[PDB]
């Protein structure tokens, strides 16, 4: 019956755990006992981007590290100019319950989505002087949580249903569908190699997928739901944040946890996680109106980016690595340097 | 100290700012409401009777205007049972219209207790509707199903003096109604700071006074907020 299947699954899990323990021979904390400390790092606000009405939920930097896009619950996507604090585009949306946005790697398209279970693709450079809807992807049954671009004709989506999807813009169908989760998948990050990508769901489990194969390859298992995930700049490790006030750093080749970032004075959860250009600083936003910077080699706090009023929702770092963009539920955007 | 195109870009940005400012008066003059409920409750009946004035969409929107003020009503119809992550979007909603079917009650009590004690859902008021009051009278009159079987504390209850029934039908129906009403208000009572209150009502799926029932509650909420702001309460 099902009893033999359960016994076989338990035996397989025990064997995998034993093998993973056998492959562990040292702790990175012991090794990292000679590197000089990063030292106290001070950061100051440079610009303040005002103009939104309701709370801001997501943002994404551009490829040229000059333009950025922001999404609000008032039903607005605003494209800013970081250097001079201007306003280029003020796209109004149909449904005012958006939860994600994405900026194309070439600068020609923008994407949005939310509770409507529809991904909208907007075109920026057109013959006329207005932005119009180009495609309305609709094949999901839950709520969109994150969207990312691979090329100008490929997009990857994550939904409230325990599925992920790869789409084709020209046709409007689903080329590949990934399944295997149990809870809601809420974050999605892409590797620089463009071949692999990670996913994090509300089951205390992180997964790695293959775009061409369409099948899972790894599974990493945290105590509560996972809110954010991000790749290491090398491409062989990643970081995850949860609601238990901890941050974890996993390595793909070793397939085992490496470090834990937590402190006894931290009770609220983590919402956004990002790295730096050199992969030395880990910036994480928390629910207690503050944001912390960790040295991802010794698990020691260094500097706080205080200055917001309500919860911090979004956080990003430019490709050129010259600024950090932070948003919150106070309808404000801050640029730190 | 600017070039020829920088000044035009600044002018365009100021025009966008003017458009955004003109797009603000329409926002604060409109009130939004979140309408929850179970499956057996008369949710669809209320939505259909509010109309006096696309196959997988996850949200539905309703517009209605009373007393020269217009409202927005939202209802979810395509999500999954788990709802601990998309309920955080509604933190700037004037009120939550809960609907309970009196004819499964403990599940509604647990849902109300969970919503009332949420961290991000504070400062949000709840308008309670106890729908399907016609069938309750017939059920209690029939006598085939006793309420004491599911609730043991029903015996040690008395009709309160402040209770005033409009129609002269029966006292037992009033006792049964006010038992449930007090059971619901007991959860709301165990709170502090007076940030959010409860507004129970006895309504049916066919009643045509629901629009004014919401209007009065919204007016009371706004008036209490303004009074508390100016140190008058």
């Amino acid at each position, epitope marked *: 019956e099902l009893d033999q299947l359960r016994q076989e699954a338990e035996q397989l899990k025990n064997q995998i755990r034993d093998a993973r323990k056998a492959c562990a021979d040292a702790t990175l904390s012991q090794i990292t006992n000679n590197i000089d400390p990063v030292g106290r790092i001070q950061m100051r606000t440079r610009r303040t981007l005002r103009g939104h009405l309701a709370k801001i939920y997501a943002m994404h930097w551009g490829t040229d590290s*000059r*333009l950025l896009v922001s999404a609000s619950q008032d039903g607005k996507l605003i494209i800013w*100019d970081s250097y001079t604090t*201007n306003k*280029v585009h003020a796209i109004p949306l149909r449904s005012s319950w958006v939860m994600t946005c994405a900026y194309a790697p070439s*600068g020609n398209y923008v994407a949005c989505g939310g509770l409507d279970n529809i991904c909208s693709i907007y075109n920026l450079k057109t*013959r*006329e*002087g*207005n932005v119009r809807v180009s495609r309305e992807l609709a094949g999901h049954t839950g709520y969109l949580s994150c969207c990312r671009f691979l090329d100008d004709n490929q997009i990857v989506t994550s939904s409230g249903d325990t599925t992920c999807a790869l789409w084709d813009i020209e046709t409007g169908q689903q080329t590949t569908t990934f399944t295997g989760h149990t809870g809601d998948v809420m974050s999605l990050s892409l590797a620089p190699d463009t071949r692999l990508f990670v996913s994090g769901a509300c089951d205390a489990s992180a997964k790695l997928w293959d775009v061409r194969e369409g099948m899972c390859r790894q599974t990493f298992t945290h105590e509560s739901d996972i809110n954010a995930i991000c790749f290491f700049p090398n491409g062989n490790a990643f970081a995850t944040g949860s609601d238990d006030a901890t941050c974890r750093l996993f390595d793909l080749r070793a397939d085992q946890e490496l470090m834990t970032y937590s402190h006894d004075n931290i009770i609220c959860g983590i919402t956004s996680v990002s790295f730096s250009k050199s992969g030395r600083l880990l910036l994480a936003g928390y629910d207690d109106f503050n944001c912390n910077v960790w040295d991802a080699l010794k698990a020691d706090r260094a500097g706080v980016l205080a200055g917001h009023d309500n919860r911090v929702s979004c956080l990003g770092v430019t490709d050129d690595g010259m600024a950090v963009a932070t948003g919150s539920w106070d309808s404000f955007l801050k640029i730190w340097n | 100290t600017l*070039s*020829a*195109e*920088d000044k*035009a*870009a600044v*002018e*365009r940005s100021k*025009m966008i700012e003017k458009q955004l400012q003109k797009d603000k008066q329409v926002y604060r003059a409109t009130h939004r409401l979140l309408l929850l409920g179970a499956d057996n409750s008369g949710k669809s009946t209320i939505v259909k009777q509010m109309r006096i004035y696309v196959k997988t969409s996850g949200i539905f929107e309703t517009k209605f205007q009373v007393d020269k003020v217009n409202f927005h009503m939202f209802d979810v119809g395509a999500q999954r049972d788990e709802r601990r992550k998309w309920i955080q979007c509604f933190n700037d909603v004037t009120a939550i219209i809960f609907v309970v079917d009196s004819s499964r009650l403990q599940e509604a009590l647990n849902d109300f207790k969970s919503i009332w004690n949420n961290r991000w859902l504070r400062t949000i008021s709840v308008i309670l509707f106890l729908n399907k009051q016609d069938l309750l009278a017939e059920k209690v009159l029939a006598g085939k199903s006793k309420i004491e079987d599911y609730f043991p504390e029903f015996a040690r209850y008395t009709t309160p003096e402040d209770a005033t029934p409009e129609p002269g039908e029966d006292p037992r129906v009033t006792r049964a109604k006010y038992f449930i009403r007090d059971e619901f208000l007991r959860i709301s009572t165990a709170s502090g700071d007076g940030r959010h209150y409860c507004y129970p009502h006895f309504t049916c799926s066919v009643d045509t006074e629901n629009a004014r029932r919401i209007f009065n509650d919204c007016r009371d909420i706004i008036q209490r907020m303004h009074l508390r702001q100016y140190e008058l309460l």
Partner: single-chain antibody
Amino acid sequence: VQLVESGGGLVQPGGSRKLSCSASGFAFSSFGMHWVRQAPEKGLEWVAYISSGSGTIYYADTVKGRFTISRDDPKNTLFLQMTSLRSEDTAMYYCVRSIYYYGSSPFDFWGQGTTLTVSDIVMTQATSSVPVTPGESVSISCRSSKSLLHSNGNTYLYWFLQRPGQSPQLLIYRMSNLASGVPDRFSGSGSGTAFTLTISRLEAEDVGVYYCMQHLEYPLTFGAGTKL
């Protein structure tokens, strides 16, 4: 997109005339508009400019107090009133559109134009005519009175080509970027005062006149031009 001009004709000196450019196929409300006049055999000139929202006005020095410009957004029309017409206003007029933001391409479309008959920074590109056979590369040079580079990093150099028989078109803007419908065969370069435009492979439809433009200052000067 369509931009059609109405007006023109022959007028005695000292009269008054109305010229109207009407647009169709694009959002007129978000585009600034200029006016460019061409003498029968003498270069190009800038005479008037209106911005988006009707908040800013500019005129030329020779028409500072005789011409007036206006637009009607709901009717999607622009028009200018000309008074005290001398013998210098016998020319062909074009209504050109431009939009200004980060990454935009001003002067992206020109109209047919209408003819009318009456009964600062200086550029020298006096290379006259350089005839050439089809198949080999060419090069056109240009010099500016003052350096056009600014502290923002840009250069503000524009190139234009007019085929014989129709309106001109845009080729290169800001001295480095390439237009939309033009091929990759054209290329451009410069250093601040000396600039050049190069065609590696020439085809039989490349005959015409080549002009230039600066946009560092509101007084706008084109140049003499060059013929192939």
